[PDB]
């Protein structure tokens, strides 16, 4: 049956960063992990590999530099068995790799569970992190182990599947792409303290204390003029259409400056509380 | 009876209310026999249950004693059925009312009533399953499981027997639905139910060991709750393979065995089946490891074993397996049944964890314990 | 001084090294980082690990192999030529003889000052489990540098997929004032002068405030001008549903 790959949050970000730079530039990397056939699949650590003159190929893997990393990655537990390789390519409608075509057959001789991951967007990512993998089929898909029992199968509905040029057949004989991501307890709290919306951390008590107080010179300086800006926004709207119909071509004009000036009053009310929150130690 | 369930919070106060109504109805002056039935089922007391049959011995009526016997066997839980059979035999019974509580005429009601008038509408049924032989097991399951609905209880093998091609087009994993469909069709057979799986039973081999595992699951659907005879039959198969497995289809054979022994012992606490399936979990099996947790959860229904709550929960954090953790999550939901606030200790641990599988079974844990009378907190 | 910018991938992978091997308090892992140390802002684009062995009972026992770095650097030359060794990181808050001496071994392959990073494996308290420090002498003096988290365009977008005002600062501000009181008490027991002399000058920054109360209410009055806008917003909130409320009676005739 088809494997279901669970990629950790750490390995998913490394494969995207290694194949990042440049549209035409292709790179290569190696994937590590320990899992068993049919379920239990996982990806532990991933790292880039040296590139030869042929780019992505079977001979580009250097066992000399690979054997030295095994003793290095064993101390921290990063050392595992090679589960496959990941690559980067400019991308096309079909066969994203213009070099690697049948080289995956040479990868199947070393490991039957090894796959080749190719990044479609190449800095086009819209936030969904859509990556493409490949698995050798050759003779099969007739009276054999049943792959499409796992998750999200029968791809190719209408003309849109993944790249949308592949539809049903995908790369070779419907390899049935399956990818899932997971996170641990340490990965959950670390990402929230680094990248969530914008990073204000590293000082927790100085976040709104430094920005809403000591930054008034670069933000709220000349607040009397700042209050005039709230009037110009209301004058831009309320002065236009007072008839609640179509004359000056406006509809939500009373609600345009309503939400924009709501935060201005809110921020002024927050700093008002933080004004007394400075705690000058006055009392009597 | 109706108001006190949604009003009285204390289980012991409402328990005494049911015992007071038994004394006024004890003389049986042509009074309600259905009220006394709801008393012994909710209380699950062997003293009041066997006392009702002792009154039927003094006043002899074959129509009155029957309606009581057929009503108890249907509404009773798994623990009360054993009292009406095993415990009733030790203290004396009625030879006419013993076979009724054993489910022989009860299972006949499922077979005989459905066989008299059955319209499957083969005209519209053929067009559904004759469309294509492909779509892997997704199509073969839809046509086999839906067909088992119409013939359920009537014991009609025409899908497997009378129709050759639809069976052969199934793959190894697709033959499970074709075999398990007989368990739905023949459900209610306490005698010849084993003869339906006879070619696929152990010792007769099979065309393959993948389809052989589905035969042990079909016995679970037919014999569920009456499968005391199949308890030692399905347990010895698991013990032989409990050591290890060298093939993938060997786990499939134990896969249907774990789900089969779970349905026969469903509702009854059994330490032998729990310890037999516990060794399978230690091997960390990808296929048969999930059914091992499902078989133990069905034996832990109702009150269950408090020690098995933390034990199965510990193995979920120690063993990080797709099917295993998800199987243990459902097993931790079934071990707590009707406990209401008593299960809040396990619910808190699942809600605090960010694991997807622990939160998947945490909802059904609330569904099973908080069911019946609605709770504003749940 | 200088600045240190660490990508979120380095801080995320450094903590994972502790859990995989279940390392106890007797062992501390050491690793290396890459980037460009030429500019004033230190940027870390890569990180690795090293088979570092250390004895807890003896601070004079440590083992570090530089040959594994040579074979690793040759692999990066075929991958990224702009990646050079800017320093190294170690695990645990404690600084012992084994941690201070090994800093000189990395100075052979590093032209600039190797960046010092103290990784907290227990992530206990506040933020920033790994602090960025610089080695400078007047006795080695380790000074704290501003820590900023900035990544590339593709790296920041990929993190959002993994995870897919006033009261917040006050919750962390209460624990910060209480922690500063313990730092003075704990430092007193260590003596029985350098930090106390600096804190007294920082704390130096109602005699002159008798006439300074007016400007406090003057700023609050300007805030009330926005409260008048809030009243206008509340007046506009009263206009919104009247558009819908009058359409309710219009539908009564149609229906």
mmCIF file of C-alpha atoms in Angstrom, chain B:
data_model
loop_
_atom_site.group_PDB
_atom_site.id
_atom_site.type_symbol
_atom_site.label_atom_id
_atom_site.label_comp_id
_atom_site.label_asym_id
_atom_site.label_seq_id
_atom_site.Cartn_x
_atom_site.Cartn_y
_atom_site.Cartn_z
ATOM 1 C CA UNK B 1 -39.367 6.610 36.770
ATOM 2 C CA UNK B 2 -39.262 9.230 34.003
ATOM 3 C CA UNK B 3 -38.968 12.397 36.101
ATOM 4 C CA UNK B 4 -36.419 11.114 38.633
ATOM 5 C CA UNK B 5 -33.871 10.465 35.869
ATOM 6 C CA UNK B 6 -33.850 14.125 34.779
ATOM 7 C CA UNK B 7 -34.319 15.445 38.343
ATOM 8 C CA UNK B 8 -32.649 13.396 41.102
ATOM 9 C CA UNK B 9 -28.873 13.801 40.909
ATOM 10 C CA UNK B 10 -28.005 11.186 43.541
ATOM 11 C CA UNK B 11 -27.882 7.684 42.078
ATOM 12 C CA UNK B 12 -28.537 6.068 45.468
ATOM 13 C CA UNK B 13 -31.681 8.092 46.226
ATOM 14 C CA UNK B 14 -33.323 7.182 42.914
ATOM 15 C CA UNK B 15 -32.160 3.594 43.478
ATOM 16 C CA UNK B 16 -34.282 3.328 46.629
ATOM 17 C CA UNK B 17 -37.309 4.712 44.767
ATOM 18 C CA UNK B 18 -37.247 1.779 42.336
ATOM 19 C CA UNK B 19 -37.042 -0.662 45.258
ATOM 20 C CA UNK B 20 -40.161 0.739 46.946
ATOM 21 C CA UNK B 21 -42.304 0.258 43.832
ATOM 22 C CA UNK B 22 -41.286 -3.417 43.729
ATOM 23 C CA UNK B 23 -43.054 -4.190 47.017
ATOM 24 C CA UNK B 24 -46.425 -2.767 45.954
ATOM 25 C CA UNK B 25 -46.189 -4.644 42.636
ATOM 26 C CA UNK B 26 -44.836 -7.841 44.226
ATOM 27 C CA UNK B 27 -48.261 -9.457 44.689
ATOM 28 C CA UNK B 28 -48.914 -9.003 40.944
ATOM 29 C CA UNK B 29 -52.757 -8.197 41.051
ATOM 30 C CA UNK B 30 -52.820 -7.972 37.241
ATOM 31 C CA UNK B 31 -50.566 -4.919 37.547
ATOM 32 C CA UNK B 32 -47.912 -3.524 35.198
ATOM 33 C CA UNK B 33 -45.108 -5.977 34.431
ATOM 34 C CA UNK B 34 -43.204 -3.385 32.370
ATOM 35 C CA UNK B 35 -42.573 -1.150 35.390
ATOM 36 C CA UNK B 36 -40.829 -3.983 37.247
ATOM 37 C CA UNK B 37 -38.727 -4.633 34.132
ATOM 38 C CA UNK B 38 -37.269 -1.111 34.141
ATOM 39 C CA UNK B 39 -36.463 -1.500 37.853
ATOM 40 C CA UNK B 40 -34.205 -4.546 37.522
ATOM 41 C CA UNK B 41 -32.436 -3.186 34.427
ATOM 42 C CA UNK B 42 -31.515 0.189 35.934
ATOM 43 C CA UNK B 43 -30.545 -1.284 39.312
ATOM 44 C CA UNK B 44 -28.894 -4.425 37.860
ATOM 45 C CA UNK B 45 -29.582 -6.146 41.187
ATOM 46 C CA UNK B 46 -29.510 -9.944 41.172
ATOM 47 C CA UNK B 47 -31.816 -10.023 44.199
ATOM 48 C CA UNK B 48 -34.736 -8.172 42.620
ATOM 49 C CA UNK B 49 -34.190 -9.723 39.180
ATOM 50 C CA UNK B 50 -34.414 -13.345 40.336
ATOM 51 C CA UNK B 51 -37.242 -12.460 42.740
ATOM 52 C CA UNK B 52 -39.486 -11.514 39.808
ATOM 53 C CA UNK B 53 -39.076 -14.983 38.288
ATOM 54 C CA UNK B 54 -39.889 -16.574 41.654
ATOM 55 C CA UNK B 55 -43.256 -14.794 41.653
ATOM 56 C CA UNK B 56 -43.983 -16.175 38.174
ATOM 57 C CA UNK B 57 -43.611 -19.675 39.643
ATOM 58 C CA UNK B 58 -46.379 -19.164 42.216
ATOM 59 C CA UNK B 59 -48.843 -17.625 39.742
ATOM 60 C CA UNK B 60 -48.494 -19.743 36.599
ATOM 61 C CA UNK B 61 -49.202 -17.935 33.328
ATOM 62 C CA UNK B 62 -47.377 -18.752 30.102
ATOM 63 C CA UNK B 63 -48.401 -15.496 28.413
ATOM 64 C CA UNK B 64 -47.484 -13.249 31.333
ATOM 65 C CA UNK B 65 -44.137 -14.878 32.144
ATOM 66 C CA UNK B 66 -43.144 -14.770 28.467
ATOM 67 C CA UNK B 67 -43.743 -11.046 27.901
ATOM 68 C CA UNK B 68 -41.542 -10.355 30.929
ATOM 69 C CA UNK B 69 -38.766 -12.661 29.713
ATOM 70 C CA UNK B 70 -38.626 -11.347 26.139
ATOM 71 C CA UNK B 71 -38.627 -7.749 27.400
ATOM 72 C CA UNK B 72 -35.737 -8.196 29.842
ATOM 73 C CA UNK B 73 -33.311 -9.840 27.402
ATOM 74 C CA UNK B 74 -33.655 -6.951 24.938
ATOM 75 C CA UNK B 75 -33.333 -4.091 27.447
ATOM 76 C CA UNK B 76 -30.660 -5.669 29.666
ATOM 77 C CA UNK B 77 -26.991 -4.739 29.588
ATOM 78 C CA UNK B 78 -24.234 -7.308 29.106
ATOM 79 C CA UNK B 79 -23.664 -7.743 32.847
ATOM 80 C CA UNK B 80 -27.370 -8.343 33.513
ATOM 81 C CA UNK B 81 -27.690 -10.938 30.732
ATOM 82 C CA UNK B 82 -25.113 -13.090 32.528
ATOM 83 C CA UNK B 83 -27.147 -12.807 35.738
ATOM 84 C CA UNK B 84 -30.295 -13.929 33.900
ATOM 85 C CA UNK B 85 -28.451 -16.986 32.520
ATOM 86 C CA UNK B 86 -25.433 -18.015 34.596
ATOM 87 C CA UNK B 87 -26.589 -16.724 37.988
ATOM 88 C CA UNK B 88 -30.214 -17.752 37.401
ATOM 89 C CA UNK B 89 -29.224 -21.384 36.787
ATOM 90 C CA UNK B 90 -27.507 -21.707 40.174
ATOM 91 C CA UNK B 91 -30.515 -20.449 42.165
ATOM 92 C CA UNK B 92 -33.110 -22.271 40.056
ATOM 93 C CA UNK B 93 -34.928 -21.291 36.883
ATOM 94 C CA UNK B 94 -37.857 -22.085 34.598
ATOM 95 C CA UNK B 95 -36.986 -24.531 31.779
ATOM 96 C CA UNK B 96 -39.397 -22.653 29.504
ATOM 97 C CA UNK B 97 -37.983 -19.230 30.445
ATOM 98 C CA UNK B 98 -34.299 -20.234 30.362
ATOM 99 C CA UNK B 99 -34.025 -20.532 26.576
ATOM 100 C CA UNK B 100 -35.750 -17.152 26.216
ATOM 101 C CA UNK B 101 -33.124 -15.347 28.300
ATOM 102 C CA UNK B 102 -30.404 -17.164 26.331
ATOM 103 C CA UNK B 103 -31.572 -15.403 23.159
ATOM 104 C CA UNK B 104 -32.715 -18.426 21.148
ATOM 105 C CA UNK B 105 -36.256 -17.129 20.413
ATOM 106 C CA UNK B 106 -34.972 -13.538 20.483
ATOM 107 C CA UNK B 107 -32.476 -14.150 17.676
ATOM 108 C CA UNK B 108 -35.255 -16.005 15.848
ATOM 109 C CA UNK B 109 -37.310 -12.795 15.863
ATOM 110 C CA UNK B 110 -34.606 -11.108 13.784
ATOM 111 C CA UNK B 111 -34.372 -14.024 11.343
ATOM 112 C CA UNK B 112 -38.040 -14.995 10.991
ATOM 113 C CA UNK B 113 -39.718 -11.571 10.905
ATOM 114 C CA UNK B 114 -37.397 -10.236 8.195
ATOM 115 C CA UNK B 115 -37.530 -13.363 6.013
ATOM 116 C CA UNK B 116 -41.321 -13.368 5.564
ATOM 117 C CA UNK B 117 -41.568 -10.032 3.716
ATOM 118 C CA UNK B 118 -38.326 -8.833 2.116
ATOM 119 C CA UNK B 119 -38.201 -6.674 -1.021
ATOM 120 C CA UNK B 120 -34.640 -5.893 -2.102
ATOM 121 C CA UNK B 121 -35.672 -4.367 -5.469
ATOM 122 C CA UNK B 122 -32.999 -6.150 -7.486
ATOM 123 C CA UNK B 123 -33.919 -4.024 -10.509
ATOM 124 C CA UNK B 124 -32.419 -0.847 -9.063
ATOM 125 C CA UNK B 125 -29.751 -2.811 -7.165
ATOM 126 C CA UNK B 126 -28.148 -4.384 -10.247
ATOM 127 C CA UNK B 127 -27.611 -1.025 -11.972
ATOM 128 C CA UNK B 128 -25.561 0.232 -9.006
ATOM 129 C CA UNK B 129 -23.065 -2.647 -8.779
ATOM 130 C CA UNK B 130 -22.821 -3.331 -12.536
ATOM 131 C CA UNK B 131 -21.403 0.111 -13.381
ATOM 132 C CA UNK B 132 -17.690 -0.648 -12.993
ATOM 133 C CA UNK B 133 -15.265 -3.173 -11.518
ATOM 134 C CA UNK B 134 -12.691 -0.492 -10.629
ATOM 135 C CA UNK B 135 -12.300 2.322 -8.086
ATOM 136 C CA UNK B 136 -10.279 -0.050 -5.836
ATOM 137 C CA UNK B 137 -12.135 -1.036 -2.625
ATOM 138 C CA UNK B 138 -14.243 2.136 -2.429
ATOM 139 C CA UNK B 139 -16.758 0.754 -4.931
ATOM 140 C CA UNK B 140 -16.684 -2.874 -3.760
ATOM 141 C CA UNK B 141 -17.398 -1.740 -0.195
ATOM 142 C CA UNK B 142 -20.365 0.447 -1.156
ATOM 143 C CA UNK B 143 -22.049 -2.355 -3.101
ATOM 144 C CA UNK B 144 -21.269 -5.116 -0.578
ATOM 145 C CA UNK B 145 -22.137 -3.278 2.646
ATOM 146 C CA UNK B 146 -25.354 -1.787 1.249
ATOM 147 C CA UNK B 147 -26.374 -5.220 -0.045
ATOM 148 C CA UNK B 148 -25.795 -6.688 3.418
ATOM 149 C CA UNK B 149 -28.350 -4.208 4.762
ATOM 150 C CA UNK B 150 -31.296 -5.571 2.766
ATOM 151 C CA UNK B 151 -30.515 -9.226 3.544
ATOM 152 C CA UNK B 152 -29.495 -8.569 7.166
ATOM 153 C CA UNK B 153 -31.053 -11.252 9.352
ATOM 154 C CA UNK B 154 -32.536 -13.215 6.436
ATOM 155 C CA UNK B 155 -29.357 -15.268 5.762
ATOM 156 C CA UNK B 156 -29.089 -14.776 2.000
ATOM 157 C CA UNK B 157 -25.644 -15.341 0.460
ATOM 158 C CA UNK B 158 -26.772 -14.494 -3.099
ATOM 159 C CA UNK B 159 -24.258 -11.632 -3.229
ATOM 160 C CA UNK B 160 -21.355 -13.979 -2.481
ATOM 161 C CA UNK B 161 -22.838 -17.162 -3.968
ATOM 162 C CA UNK B 162 -25.285 -16.288 -6.754
ATOM 163 C CA UNK B 163 -23.060 -13.467 -8.084
ATOM 164 C CA UNK B 164 -19.584 -14.677 -9.051
ATOM 165 C CA UNK B 165 -17.853 -11.645 -10.652
ATOM 166 C CA UNK B 166 -18.275 -9.067 -7.875
ATOM 167 C CA UNK B 167 -16.299 -11.281 -5.473
ATOM 168 C CA UNK B 168 -13.298 -11.907 -7.728
ATOM 169 C CA UNK B 169 -12.716 -8.253 -8.619
ATOM 170 C CA UNK B 170 -11.902 -7.448 -4.977
ATOM 171 C CA UNK B 171 -8.313 -6.942 -3.841
ATOM 172 C CA UNK B 172 -6.788 -8.356 -0.648
ATOM 173 C CA UNK B 173 -8.154 -5.583 1.577
ATOM 174 C CA UNK B 174 -11.378 -5.370 -0.457
ATOM 175 C CA UNK B 175 -12.319 -8.985 0.341
ATOM 176 C CA UNK B 176 -12.893 -7.943 3.968
ATOM 177 C CA UNK B 177 -16.195 -6.222 3.160
ATOM 178 C CA UNK B 178 -17.365 -9.169 1.049
ATOM 179 C CA UNK B 179 -16.680 -11.528 3.960
ATOM 180 C CA UNK B 180 -17.906 -9.176 6.701
ATOM 181 C CA UNK B 181 -21.138 -8.667 4.742
ATOM 182 C CA UNK B 182 -22.113 -12.222 5.698
ATOM 183 C CA UNK B 183 -21.801 -11.230 9.356
ATOM 184 C CA UNK B 184 -24.444 -8.554 8.812
ATOM 185 C CA UNK B 185 -26.639 -10.800 6.652
ATOM 186 C CA UNK B 186 -26.429 -13.862 8.922
ATOM 187 C CA UNK B 187 -26.509 -11.816 12.151
ATOM 188 C CA UNK B 188 -28.664 -13.611 14.701
ATOM 189 C CA UNK B 189 -27.518 -17.190 13.999
ATOM 190 C CA UNK B 190 -26.431 -18.953 17.199
ATOM 191 C CA UNK B 191 -25.999 -22.383 15.557
ATOM 192 C CA UNK B 192 -25.072 -22.381 11.844
ATOM 193 C CA UNK B 193 -23.314 -19.000 11.947
ATOM 194 C CA UNK B 194 -19.973 -20.803 12.116
ATOM 195 C CA UNK B 195 -20.879 -22.843 9.023
ATOM 196 C CA UNK B 196 -21.088 -19.638 6.966
ATOM 197 C CA UNK B 197 -17.388 -18.934 7.589
ATOM 198 C CA UNK B 198 -16.532 -22.669 7.570
ATOM 199 C CA UNK B 199 -14.246 -22.553 4.480
ATOM 200 C CA UNK B 200 -12.452 -19.481 5.878
ATOM 201 C CA UNK B 201 -12.168 -20.777 9.453
ATOM 202 C CA UNK B 202 -8.695 -21.697 10.750
ATOM 203 C CA UNK B 203 -7.637 -25.219 9.848
ATOM 204 C CA UNK B 204 -9.492 -25.116 6.520
ATOM 205 C CA UNK B 205 -7.109 -22.394 5.251
ATOM 206 C CA UNK B 206 -8.478 -20.146 2.479
ATOM 207 C CA UNK B 207 -7.675 -18.701 -0.940
ATOM 208 C CA UNK B 208 -5.540 -16.157 0.942
ATOM 209 C CA UNK B 209 -4.825 -15.119 4.516
ATOM 210 C CA UNK B 210 -6.066 -11.567 3.878
ATOM 211 C CA UNK B 211 -9.663 -12.696 3.335
ATOM 212 C CA UNK B 212 -9.268 -15.242 6.152
ATOM 213 C CA UNK B 213 -9.042 -12.433 8.707
ATOM 214 C CA UNK B 214 -12.499 -11.199 7.739
ATOM 215 C CA UNK B 215 -14.089 -14.493 8.784
ATOM 216 C CA UNK B 216 -13.135 -13.999 12.436
ATOM 217 C CA UNK B 217 -14.739 -10.545 12.264
ATOM 218 C CA UNK B 218 -17.986 -11.916 10.832
ATOM 219 C CA UNK B 219 -18.413 -14.090 13.918
ATOM 220 C CA UNK B 220 -18.285 -10.947 16.052
ATOM 221 C CA UNK B 221 -21.246 -9.286 14.340
ATOM 222 C CA UNK B 222 -23.471 -12.377 14.471
ATOM 223 C CA UNK B 223 -22.642 -13.600 17.988
ATOM 224 C CA UNK B 224 -22.231 -10.165 19.614
ATOM 225 C CA UNK B 225 -23.204 -10.411 23.282
ATOM 226 C CA UNK B 226 -24.080 -14.109 22.943
ATOM 227 C CA UNK B 227 -20.546 -15.056 21.890
ATOM 228 C CA UNK B 228 -19.594 -16.728 25.168
ATOM 229 C CA UNK B 229 -19.278 -19.941 23.140
ATOM 230 C CA UNK B 230 -16.920 -18.137 20.736
ATOM 231 C CA UNK B 231 -14.919 -16.499 23.546
ATOM 232 C CA UNK B 232 -12.421 -19.344 23.952
ATOM 233 C CA UNK B 233 -12.519 -19.979 20.192
ATOM 234 C CA UNK B 234 -11.422 -16.452 19.247
ATOM 235 C CA UNK B 235 -8.998 -16.108 22.176
ATOM 236 C CA UNK B 236 -6.779 -19.092 21.329
ATOM 237 C CA UNK B 237 -6.174 -17.683 17.839
ATOM 238 C CA UNK B 238 -4.817 -14.437 19.300
ATOM 239 C CA UNK B 239 -2.601 -16.171 21.877
ATOM 240 C CA UNK B 240 -0.841 -18.204 19.177
ATOM 241 C CA UNK B 241 0.005 -15.041 17.213
ATOM 242 C CA UNK B 242 0.524 -12.888 20.326
ATOM 243 C CA UNK B 243 4.255 -13.661 20.362
ATOM 244 C CA UNK B 244 5.241 -12.051 17.055
ATOM 245 C CA UNK B 245 4.373 -11.911 13.356
ATOM 246 C CA UNK B 246 6.599 -12.523 10.350
ATOM 247 C CA UNK B 247 4.087 -11.581 7.654
ATOM 248 C CA UNK B 248 1.636 -8.753 7.046
ATOM 249 C CA UNK B 249 -1.413 -10.961 6.438
ATOM 250 C CA UNK B 250 -0.808 -12.705 9.776
ATOM 251 C CA UNK B 251 -1.730 -9.428 11.477
ATOM 252 C CA UNK B 252 -4.825 -9.316 9.256
ATOM 253 C CA UNK B 253 -5.834 -12.709 10.660
ATOM 254 C CA UNK B 254 -5.477 -11.315 14.187
ATOM 255 C CA UNK B 255 -7.074 -8.029 13.078
ATOM 256 C CA UNK B 256 -10.451 -9.700 12.589
ATOM 257 C CA UNK B 257 -9.852 -11.819 15.687
ATOM 258 C CA UNK B 258 -9.363 -8.801 17.960
ATOM 259 C CA UNK B 259 -12.505 -7.132 16.612
ATOM 260 C CA UNK B 260 -14.312 -10.473 16.755
ATOM 261 C CA UNK B 261 -13.458 -11.230 20.379
ATOM 262 C CA UNK B 262 -14.294 -7.621 21.231
ATOM 263 C CA UNK B 263 -17.864 -7.851 19.938
ATOM 264 C CA UNK B 264 -18.618 -11.220 21.558
ATOM 265 C CA UNK B 265 -17.316 -10.051 24.953
ATOM 266 C CA UNK B 266 -18.637 -6.510 24.378
ATOM 267 C CA UNK B 267 -19.969 -5.072 27.625
ATOM 268 C CA UNK B 268 -18.523 -7.878 29.777
ATOM 269 C CA UNK B 269 -15.288 -7.353 31.705
ATOM 270 C CA UNK B 270 -12.768 -10.087 30.864
ATOM 271 C CA UNK B 271 -9.219 -10.065 32.212
ATOM 272 C CA UNK B 272 -8.130 -12.908 29.908
ATOM 273 C CA UNK B 273 -9.015 -11.059 26.696
ATOM 274 C CA UNK B 274 -7.519 -7.853 28.108
ATOM 275 C CA UNK B 275 -4.208 -9.557 28.911
ATOM 276 C CA UNK B 276 -4.240 -11.432 25.592
ATOM 277 C CA UNK B 277 -4.637 -8.216 23.587
ATOM 278 C CA UNK B 278 -2.186 -6.398 25.879
ATOM 279 C CA UNK B 279 0.740 -8.456 24.572
ATOM 280 C CA UNK B 280 -0.216 -7.566 20.992
ATOM 281 C CA UNK B 281 0.099 -3.871 21.866
ATOM 282 C CA UNK B 282 3.642 -4.457 23.149
ATOM 283 C CA UNK B 283 4.736 -5.641 19.694
ATOM 284 C CA UNK B 284 3.593 -2.273 18.243
ATOM 285 C CA UNK B 285 1.720 -3.666 15.256
ATOM 286 C CA UNK B 286 0.609 -1.276 12.526
ATOM 287 C CA UNK B 287 -2.420 -3.309 11.399
ATOM 288 C CA UNK B 288 -3.423 -5.689 14.199
ATOM 289 C CA UNK B 289 -2.256 -3.205 16.842
ATOM 290 C CA UNK B 290 -5.261 -0.948 16.265
ATOM 291 C CA UNK B 291 -7.842 -3.728 16.627
ATOM 292 C CA UNK B 292 -6.206 -4.862 19.877
ATOM 293 C CA UNK B 293 -7.151 -1.554 21.505
ATOM 294 C CA UNK B 294 -10.672 -1.705 20.058
ATOM 295 C CA UNK B 295 -11.199 -5.213 21.428
ATOM 296 C CA UNK B 296 -10.169 -4.180 24.939
ATOM 297 C CA UNK B 297 -12.375 -1.080 24.941
ATOM 298 C CA UNK B 298 -15.517 -3.104 24.252
ATOM 299 C CA UNK B 299 -14.831 -5.307 27.290
ATOM 300 C CA UNK B 300 -14.313 -2.205 29.470
ATOM 301 C CA UNK B 301 -17.723 -0.688 28.675
ATOM 302 C CA UNK B 302 -19.803 0.545 31.584
ATOM 303 C CA UNK B 303 -17.869 0.903 34.836
ATOM 304 C CA UNK B 304 -14.765 -0.850 33.529
ATOM 305 C CA UNK B 305 -11.399 -1.152 35.229
ATOM 306 C CA UNK B 306 -9.937 2.044 36.750
ATOM 307 C CA UNK B 307 -6.406 0.636 36.481
ATOM 308 C CA UNK B 308 -6.771 0.115 32.719
ATOM 309 C CA UNK B 309 -7.576 3.828 32.310
ATOM 310 C CA UNK B 310 -4.068 5.058 33.133
ATOM 311 C CA UNK B 311 -2.354 1.990 31.649
ATOM 312 C CA UNK B 312 -3.791 2.387 28.146
ATOM 313 C CA UNK B 313 -3.245 6.151 28.383
ATOM 314 C CA UNK B 314 0.437 5.656 29.238
ATOM 315 C CA UNK B 315 1.006 3.420 26.202
ATOM 316 C CA UNK B 316 -0.336 6.201 23.962
ATOM 317 C CA UNK B 317 2.466 8.586 24.952
ATOM 318 C CA UNK B 318 5.135 5.863 24.918
ATOM 319 C CA UNK B 319 4.169 4.381 21.524
ATOM 320 C CA UNK B 320 3.711 6.983 18.786
ATOM 321 C CA UNK B 321 1.985 4.990 16.044
ATOM 322 C CA UNK B 322 -0.659 6.248 13.626
ATOM 323 C CA UNK B 323 -3.134 3.388 13.961
ATOM 324 C CA UNK B 324 -1.972 2.551 17.496
ATOM 325 C CA UNK B 325 -2.486 5.987 19.057
ATOM 326 C CA UNK B 326 -5.798 6.438 17.234
ATOM 327 C CA UNK B 327 -6.868 2.960 18.328
ATOM 328 C CA UNK B 328 -5.944 3.703 21.937
ATOM 329 C CA UNK B 329 -7.821 7.014 21.731
ATOM 330 C CA UNK B 330 -11.065 5.205 20.901
ATOM 331 C CA UNK B 331 -10.284 2.569 23.530
ATOM 332 C CA UNK B 332 -9.930 5.272 26.177
ATOM 333 C CA UNK B 333 -13.339 6.589 25.098
ATOM 334 C CA UNK B 334 -15.067 3.209 25.439
ATOM 335 C CA UNK B 335 -13.550 2.387 28.842
ATOM 336 C CA UNK B 336 -15.535 5.302 30.322
ATOM 337 C CA UNK B 337 -19.253 4.744 29.685
ATOM 338 C CA UNK B 338 -21.981 6.468 31.676
ATOM 339 C CA UNK B 339 -19.473 7.663 34.282
ATOM 340 C CA UNK B 340 -20.376 11.356 33.702
ATOM 341 C CA UNK B 341 -18.078 13.421 35.983
ATOM 342 C CA UNK B 342 -16.029 10.325 36.882
ATOM 343 C CA UNK B 343 -14.380 10.481 33.433
ATOM 344 C CA UNK B 344 -13.323 14.140 33.756
ATOM 345 C CA UNK B 345 -9.804 13.092 34.798
ATOM 346 C CA UNK B 346 -9.151 11.513 31.392
ATOM 347 C CA UNK B 347 -10.956 14.284 29.489
ATOM 348 C CA UNK B 348 -8.706 16.961 31.005
ATOM 349 C CA UNK B 349 -5.555 15.148 29.867
ATOM 350 C CA UNK B 350 -6.808 14.963 26.270
ATOM 351 C CA UNK B 351 -7.946 18.595 26.076
ATOM 352 C CA UNK B 352 -4.624 19.880 27.437
ATOM 353 C CA UNK B 353 -2.652 17.903 24.831
ATOM 354 C CA UNK B 354 -2.211 19.290 21.318
ATOM 355 C CA UNK B 355 -2.138 15.831 19.709
ATOM 356 C CA UNK B 356 -4.671 15.389 16.916
ATOM 357 C CA UNK B 357 -5.565 11.807 17.849
ATOM 358 C CA UNK B 358 -5.967 12.520 21.572
ATOM 359 C CA UNK B 359 -8.430 15.322 20.788
ATOM 360 C CA UNK B 360 -10.264 13.150 18.244
ATOM 361 C CA UNK B 361 -11.246 10.583 20.875
ATOM 362 C CA UNK B 362 -11.730 13.171 23.609
ATOM 363 C CA UNK B 363 -15.000 14.346 22.071
ATOM 364 C CA UNK B 364 -16.497 10.846 21.924
ATOM 365 C CA UNK B 365 -15.438 10.335 25.549
ATOM 366 C CA UNK B 366 -17.828 13.163 26.431
ATOM 367 C CA UNK B 367 -20.460 11.688 24.100
ATOM 368 C CA UNK B 368 -20.509 8.262 25.764
ATOM 369 C CA UNK B 369 -20.471 9.270 29.441
ATOM 370 C CA UNK B 370 -22.716 12.352 29.178
ATOM 371 C CA UNK B 371 -25.302 10.694 26.910
ATOM 372 C CA UNK B 372 -28.895 10.076 27.916
ATOM 373 C CA UNK B 373 -29.952 12.934 30.183
ATOM 374 C CA UNK B 374 -28.521 16.123 28.733
ATOM 375 C CA UNK B 375 -25.873 18.084 30.614
ATOM 376 C CA UNK B 376 -25.336 21.828 30.267
ATOM 377 C CA UNK B 377 -21.635 21.370 31.072
ATOM 378 C CA UNK B 378 -21.020 18.762 28.360
#
